[PDB]
């Protein structure tokens, strides 16, 4: 469920937040996302 504050457990990466569609350019070998200060920002759906 998107655009709704939910607890997520993507591939053992526990946390909480609001997730939605994005226009990142994840390379085929990429799995996670991060920012300048090293906080997980984007994740790739294991079944999608």
């Amino acid at each position: 469920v998107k655009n709704k504050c939910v607890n997520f457990n993507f591939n053992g990466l526990t946390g909480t937040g609001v997730l939605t569609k994005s226009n990142k350019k994840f390379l085929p070998f990429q799995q996670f996302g991060r920012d300048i200060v090293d906080t997980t920002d984007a994740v790739r759906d294991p079944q999608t």
Binding site: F26, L27, F29, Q30, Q31, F32, R34, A42
Partner: peptide, 24 residues
């Protein structure tokens, strides 16, 4: 056979250390 001449690698041979996306 083979030779063992020496050259300079320039700026070459950098891979992605991890699998984490980063921009700017």
């Amino acid at each position: 056979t083979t030779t063992q001449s020496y050259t300079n690698s320039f700026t070459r041979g950098v891979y992605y250390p991890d699998k984490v996306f980063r921009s700017s």
